[PDB]
Amino acid sequence: EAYKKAKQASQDAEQAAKDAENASKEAEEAAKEAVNLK
């Protein structure tokens, strides 16, 4: 079932961390922080 385990440590923290980066992977491109690091 989905009783007593860590429900915060699962693919619910893994996926919500992935479509968290994905907007700054797209909206990087006006800065470009491969070729700036300052």
Q: In one letter, which amino acid is 4?
A: K
Residue 36, Cα to own-chain centre: how many angstroms? Answer: 21
DSSP SS3 for 7: coil
Q: How far apart, in whole angstroms, are the C-alpha atoms of residue 17 and residue 28? A: 17
C-alpha to C-alpha distance for 36 and 33, rounded to whole angstroms: 5
Whole-angstrom Cα distance, residue 26 to residue 3? 38
Angle at 26 between CA 10 and CA 22, to 5 degrees: 0
